[PDB]
Design a binder for this molecule. Structure first.
Ligand code: HEM
Ligand code: HEM
Ligand SMILES: CCN(C)CCN1CCCc2cc(NC(=N)c3cccs3)ccc21
Ligand SMILES: CCN(C)CCN1CCCc2cc(NC(=N)c3cccs3)ccc21
Ligand SMILES: C[C@H](O)[C@H](O)[C@H]1CNc2nc(N)[nH]c(=O)c2N1
Ligand SMILES: C[C@H](O)[C@H](O)[C@H]1CNc2nc(N)[nH]c(=O)c2N1
Ligand SMILES: [Cl-]
Ligand SMILES: [Cl-]
Ligand SMILES: [Gd]
Ligand SMILES: [Gd]
Ligand SMILES: [Zn+2]
Lengths: 401, 402
């Protein structure tokens, strides 16, 4: 039972929950691979039993009545068909547990508040688009963002798969050059090349919201233009740097992850987009200041008249902080839900104490919980953490080509 | 079948073949990663020594030669006759550099080849130990132009107790448990402060009181020694544009000299071998001054800056910590004392990673320690995957002598 210390306070806890880890991670006694982003048929019934048992434990209903009974239908269901369907409540309870189990999510204090749009009866690329559109409208909610996941049908053999080709529902274009250099978002240059190579007419500039390459089983994808009134965006301005708005920066309101594979009770949903709301450092520090992203750090520093000629003026640090200040200011003025890295990390500490008394620990990936600016100024920096894989869970999956 | 490692900023990909040589085992399993934890028979002495000698004769391109096999037999024979063996002076110098080279949480390893090794293995008392230590401080400080050095005291050996330095660093500030349960001075040093007093030290009552050295000779109680004030170079902290900052009265010392770690070379153990380089500014500005459990100045600085401290989304914490690091850098440059900022230091660590990949096929690195505690993704190490593992020779932690 791994001993875990908080170095700010001196408190000690043991992670007893770690003892139930499943799909093994990448580390061995001889080397640690915790800093790697992507680390490297009678079985369906075993993962199926375990999830059903997890369900009835939560609802105070282990050992009696329907506990026995639901174990049988999935037995018989896989006996005849080779797979099974989840009760709508299970799909809801599995959805929330997989969020609860995501080691890299700092927002999990919210895990109990989630809206599951059951789209298991989906049947075409036109059906998805409206299911995605109800999601985006429901989650955006005029800027009062609400956590939501939409679950499309569970993959089966013999036929294809529902898969959203974009990493997120809202992404910006990336246009190349004679010199290769990208106008727009360099992270999305690939999916931008597939969107043009499928019908879309490429826009002019930096923040062109990409279309949507949606793919119904077996058939090639179809482009879908997003309603410009459905894509809530926030123009970026700074509370006191008057020229900041003139930089013409923007970001969208809804972070909606549309390529991860949701896995409940052994069933694999390759299309199950979840959305929440942003922590401000994601937009201000990574999206805008990463060297391989919008890479605006130096442009902002010039406007602040900072001394970029020496690293020890800390001009990068100063410009980055104001970029974050502008993100937070802009989202609040637009009345769009956003959380700063200080409040977010402090709620995660509260989440860890919650998870300690409830489940005896919490899987957390320290490198992704600590925010990308001001890490030791947040409490999670001084908190030792244990990282492992529990089920149900979200997983990464190969790109569909 | 070797770990593939990606740099996300540039796209490059390498494989860490050196990790397969990992001479020991860390805390992680396929079940669970514990990488974020701060603290994770002659035959066996023989194979450790054998591996080091192999290493030493590889570095001098005498791999598998006459001298090489001579030394193997010599060591084999001396472990048989005495239970231990003795390092040659050149072996000791090579082993101390390799221990630095191998330290996975050190971001300054671009420097690992430039290390001054003082051989103190003939040391005989606590009083002589004090003289070697004072010479180390004087040489490494060098009036502000810092030089990396290590002084290596007699090795652990059967029949005799250990040489130990009780202090965690050669220069530390006292932490006096005030009567409110609070602390005046550095709270990380309350324990060693209590010990110095208990061992005869007359304590001061300032925030920046330099601790005496508690030096333990084999099978002897520790003995108190005061550092000559003019040996301890300090930097008063001022800010280039915030003139009230000087009125905080903050100081820090020039020489970071870690004195409580164990140096391991070829199975031999040196419980007392203090080493010193120079500071990266974030250690002082972010960790030592702003950690809530250290000097914890962040809020008092933000109030003085007139930041809005009632709400977190004003980023007052971030703004105040950035100005504290600016003051640290400005002050050390003013005083002409070596210091490196986290941008320069992480840039040079990327070059070390590239040197080490051509040289040994990889480099053991602890990502959570290499990425600075502010502005992480603004430095290139943030976007570099890393493989953490233990190679020997090595610096290791060891239990406190008391
Ligand atoms: C409600 C506010 C939320 C906030 C502020 C938040 C914040 C974050 C952040 C900053 C990350 C860092 C990962 C990255 O940037 O690539 C992350 C990871 C993640 N989040 Fe959340 N999140 C929220 C809600 C949710 C919800 C509703 C779900 C799903 C139901 C979710 C699932 C995940 C997953 C799967 C990851 C990646 C975990 C991994 O790769 O191991 N989050 N979150
Ligand atoms: C010359 C400039 C140097 C710089 C800028 C530097 C920088 C650093 C920093 C920032 C850390 C993390 C420590 C912390 O945050 O508490 C560290 C760790 C460390 N450094 Fe260096 N260092 C330097 C020289 C040296 C030398 C000369 C040695 C030994 C001969 C050394 C050995 C170590 C070790 C053993 C650790 C801890 C590694 C571990 O616990 O696994 N460093 N260094
Ligand atoms: C490709 C970029 N990285 C590697 C993965 C993208 N991703 C993976 C899933 C977690 C994640 C979270 C955010 N932000 C959020 N707050 C949320 C998105 C959805 C619910 S909350 C943004 C991106 C990602
Ligand atoms: C005990 C507290 N933690 C765990 C480690 C503190 N420590 C010991 C390990 C290395 C270390 C390095 C620095 N800084 C430096 N630049 C140096 C010190 C000596 C040469 S360079 C400061 C403190 C520490
Ligand atoms: C190499 C390193 O693991 C990589 O840059 C990680 C570090 N931590 C991160 N943390 C979050 N939240 N998001 C990221 O993309 C990353 N990138
Ligand atoms: C618990 C956590 O691992 C701990 O606070 C670590 C994180 N990274 C660090 N990195 C450095 N360089 N020094 C430290 O003391 C720490 N502390
Ligand atoms: Cl994003
Ligand atoms: Cl220090
Ligand atoms: Gd101007
Ligand atoms: Gd001023
Ligand atoms: Zn690990």
């Amino acid at each position: 039972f791994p001993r875990v210390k908080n170095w700010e306070v001196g408190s000690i806890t043991y992670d007893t929950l770690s003892a139930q880890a499943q799909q093994d991670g990448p580390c061995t006694p001889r080397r640690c691979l915790g800093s790697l982003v992507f680390p490297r048929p009678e079985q369906l019934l075993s993962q199926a039993r375990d999830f059903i048992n997890q369900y009835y434990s939560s609802i105070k209903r282990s050992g009696s009545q329907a506990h026995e009974q639901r174990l049988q239908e999935v037995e018989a269901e896989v006996a005849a068909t080779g797979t099974y369907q989840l009760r709508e409540s299970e799909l809801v309870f599995g959805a929330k547990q997989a969020w609860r189990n995501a080691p890299r999510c700092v927002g999990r204090i919210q895990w109990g508040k989630l809206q599951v749009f059951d789209a298991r009866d989906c049947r075409s690329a036109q059906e998805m688009f409206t299911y995605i559109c109800n999601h985006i409208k429901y989650a955006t909610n005029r800027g009062n963002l609400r956590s939501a996941i939409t679950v499309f049908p569970q993959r089966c053999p013999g036929r294809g798969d529902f898969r959203i080709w974009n990493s997120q529902l809202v992404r910006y274009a990336g246009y190349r050059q004679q010199d290769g250099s990208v106008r727009g978002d360099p992270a999305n240059v690939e999916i931008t090349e597939l969107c043009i190579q499928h019908g879309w007419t490429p826009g002019n500039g930096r923040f062109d919201v990409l279309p949507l390459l949606l793919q119904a089983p077996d058939e090639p994808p179809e482009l879908f233009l997003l309603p410009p009134e459905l894509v809530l965006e926030v123009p970026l301005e700074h509370p006191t740097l008057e020229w900041f708005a003139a930089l013409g920066l923007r970001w969208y309101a809804l972070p909606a992850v549309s390529n991860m594979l949701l896995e409940i009770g052994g069933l694999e949903f390759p299309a199950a987009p979840f959305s929440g709301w942003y922590m401000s450092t994601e937009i201000g520090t990574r999206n805008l200041c990463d060297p391989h992203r919008y890479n605006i750090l130096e442009d902002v520093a010039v406007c602040m008249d900072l001394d970029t000629r020496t690293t020890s003026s800390l001009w990068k640090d100063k410009a980055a902080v104001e970029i974050n200040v502008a993100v937070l200011h802009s989202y609040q003025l637009a009345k769009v839900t956003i959380v700063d890295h200080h409040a977010a990390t402090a709620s995660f500490m509260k989440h860890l104490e919650n998870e300690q008394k409830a489940r005896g620990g919490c899987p957390a990936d320290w490198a992704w919980i600590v925010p990308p600016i001001s890490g030791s100024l947040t409490p999670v920096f001084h908190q030792e953490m244990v990282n492992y894989f529990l089920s149900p869970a979200f997983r990464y999956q190969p790109d569909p080509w």
